């Protein structure tokens, strides 16, 4: 799988477990088409969203449902979600790790892009 | 003005100047309606986007054109843009700050008196 | 004043108020000599730490007392403090910003005219 | 090993490879005693710094040599190093991951603390 999402909690110093993630891909008509979804594991990781074959060139949006995560812990957070929008595989196939570090009123995201 | 946007560059240690910023408000049909826009100043700040009267409760999106910023410096960036999506709640000043790198960004909200 | 420190709270979305900040300068014997200190204001800022005359080239450390800040909110934090260590170079205004969470912090430098 | 250090590069979107790391522990006389050191691998990770037996209660400092890392890539960075100072194992043994995300004029650090 060439796409992995990793989420960390900066309040608890832990993986962010059971975080919903929705991935969208921009269609030829400029709409966001559902691409894949899942939720983070006990390690804060979400593996197996897609395959090398399915993960073609395109503009992708990874939506991390931060608000639902914080509400479940009794915190009323600032953001609706964290959205990561990027062009993928435009110089051929790459592996992407999208990491997010969450606080109630802030988040940080980074990408690690590797060439198999 | 109850909304200010501040953009910083983590590579050069400077304000991010002349960055396009677009603000949208979510409509009843779940589409994003253009609300306000501008370019960051020499201080990396964008003031005067809206008024207390116009800035009613609702879901807003701040889109920062990070890709054009990095391309203008000759740096190949990861993201198409940085998006900050939040609910304005009357329960009164919002500063949306973003700290930019080519493959990463950090955003915070400073919500005060 | 060529040095300003700004501290923000990522949990509450607010300035970090009444945070102790200590600045040190590295001496010839590699020890840290006290240089300036204060507490962040209601805006999370600490101004007037030094002067252009005093703030000569050298290695400085800004120590932010994050542990006392979180303990005062009833939150158990990870770090003893946040330390920012940098060289001042005359080749002229330095803002050291820190964004605090209980188990994390982000720091940036904004170095301008 | 109950201590792992992970370093990421926010300019290149990659692990930060060959980053020197020095760990110190506060002695009874309030000095920083050398505890362990090493450098990040091709994955940006540094494993095997210590053992459960050796990693006793104490105040530890993890110094990440960011300046040497950036200078090696032709960037003149702002910070001398990134220092992470924390009390460890004061409620019994824990596993600590210290992560740092680096830019020339900025860094972010977080801890992931797990109970074996
Ligand atoms: O990770 C980070 C994300 C955001 C920030 C904000 C810093 C900052 C600095 C200023 O001088 C004014 C301001 O309104 C904000 C810092 C770090
Ligand atoms: O501001 C930030 C600070 C730290 C991080 C960490 C990301 C990360 C990604 C991994 O694959 C493993 C890991 O241990 C950590 C992300 C953002
Ligand atoms: Na191509
Ligand atoms: Na104890």
End-to-end CA distance of chain A: 11
In contact, B55 and B2? CB cutoff 8 Å:
yes
As beta bridge partners, residue B104 has A110, B101
- Smallest Cα distance from D64 to chain B, Å: 18
Resolution in A: 1.4
C10 lines ligand 1 (CB under 6 A): no
Kindly report the backbone phi and psi dihedral angles of residue B71, in degrees, each rounded to the nearest multiple of 5, phi listed first: -65, -35
B93: left (phi over 0), alpha (psi -120 to 50) or beta: beta
Query: What are A88-97's contacts with CB under 8 Å, separation 24+?
Result: A88/A3, A88/A55, A88/A57, A88/A58, A88/A59, A88/A60, A89/A55, A89/A56, A89/A57, A89/A58, A90/A57, A93/A2, A93/A52, A93/A55, A94/A2, A95/A2, A95/A3, A95/A4, A96/A2, A96/A3, A96/A4, A97/A4, A97/A5, A97/A6
Q: CATH number for the domain including B34?
A: 2.60.40.180
**Closest residue by Cα to residue D12 from D65, D80, D94, D74:** D74
Q: C-alpha angle B68/B74/B75, rounded to 5°?
A: 80
In contact, D7 and D44? CB cutoff 8 Å:
yes
- Smallest Cα distance from B11 to chain C, Å: 10
**Closest residue by Cα to residue B69 from B15, B6, B16:** B16
Rg (alpha carbons) of chain D, rounded to whole number: 14
Contacts of A109 (CB under 8 A, 6+ apart): A82, A84, A98, A99, A100, A101, B104, B105
**Closest residue by Cα to residue A8 from D46, D4, B111, C102:** C102
Query: Across chain A, which distance is largest between two alpha carbons, in Å?
Result: 44
Instruction: Report the distance separating Cα B81 and Cα B105, nearest Å.
Output: 10
Instruction: Report the distance separating Cα C100 and Cα C82, nearest Å.
Output: 9
User: Closest chain D residue to A102 measured between Cα atoms?
Assistant: D110
Instruction: Report the distance separating Cα B79 and Cα B72, nearest Å.
Output: 15
Instruction: Report the distance separating Cα D25 and Cα D32, nearest Å.
Output: 6
Contacts of D19 (CB under 8 A, 6+ apart): D7, D39, D40, D44, D46, D64, D65, D66, D68, D69
Contacts of D103 in chain B (CB under 8 A): 10-11, 101, 104
Q: Which helix (H) or strand (E) holds A96?
A: strand A95-103
Token readout for B59 is: 């879901």
Q: C-alpha angle B85/D12/B61, rounded to 5°?
A: 10
Question: Is B54 part of any known ligand binding site?
Answer: no
Binding-site residues of A for L-thyroxine: 6, 45, 108
Residue range(s) defining the domain that contains residue A99: 3-114
Please name the residue that has the structure tokens 């009843």: B28
**Measuring CA to CA, how many Å separate C85 from each of A12, A36, B60, C24, D39?**
26, 43, 38, 9, 20
- DSSP conformational letter for C44: S
CA of D73 to the centre of ligand 3 (A): 27
Instruction: Name the domain count of chain D.
Output: 1
Burial class (CB in 10 A: 0-12, 13-18, 19+), C56: exposed
CA of A100 to the centre of ligand 3 (A): 27
Q: Which helix (H) or strand (E) holds A61?
A: strand A58-64
Query: What are A77-82's contacts with CB under 8 Å, separation 24+?
Result: A77/A104, A77/A105, A78/A104, A78/A105, A78/A106, A78/B86, A78/B109, A78/B111, A78/C13, A79/A105, A79/A107, A79/B84, A79/B85, A79/B86, A79/B109, A80/B59, A80/B85, A80/B86, A80/B87, A81/B85, A82/A107, A82/A109
In contact, C73 and C101? CB cutoff 8 Å:
no
D99: left (phi over 0), alpha (psi -120 to 50) or beta: beta
Instruction: Report the distance separating Cα D61 and Cα B1, nearest Å.
Output: 44
Token readout for A70 is: 């914080």
Atom index in ligand 2 nearest the CA of residue A112 equals: 11
DSSP string, C80-104: EEEEEEEEE----EEEEEEEEETTE
Atom index in ligand 1 nearest the CA of residue C106 equals: 1
CA of D6 to the centre of ligand 2 (A): 8
Question: Is B106 part of any known ligand binding site?
Answer: yes
C108 lines ligand 1 (CB under 6 A): yes
Please name the residue that has the structure tokens 């605090």: C100
Pocket of ligand 2 (CB under 6 A): A 6, 8, 97, 99, 101, 108, 110; D 6, 97, 99, 101, 108, 110
Chain-chain contact of A13 with C102 (C-beta, under 8 angstroms): yes
Which residues of chain D come before a gap where C and the next N are over 2.5 Å apart? none
Hey, of A8, A44, A105, which one would you mutate to test binding to chain C, going by the most C CBs within 10 A of its CB?
Answer: A105
């Amino acid at each position: 799988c060439p796409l992995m999402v990793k989420v960390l909690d900066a309040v608890r110093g832990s993986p962010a477990i059971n975080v919903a993630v929705h991935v969208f891909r921009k269609a030829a008509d400029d709409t966001w088409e559902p691409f894949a979804s899942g939720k983070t594991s006990e390690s804060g990781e979400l593996h197996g969203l897609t395959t090398e074959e399915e993960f073609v060139e395109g503009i992708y949006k990874v939506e991390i449902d931060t608000k639902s995560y914080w509400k479940a812990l009794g915190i009323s957070p600032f953001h609706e979600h964290a959205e990561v929008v990027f062009t993928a595989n435009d110089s051929g196939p790459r592996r992407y790790t999208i990491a997010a570090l969450l606080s109630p009123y802030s988040y940080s995201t980074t990408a690690v892009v590797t060439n198999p």
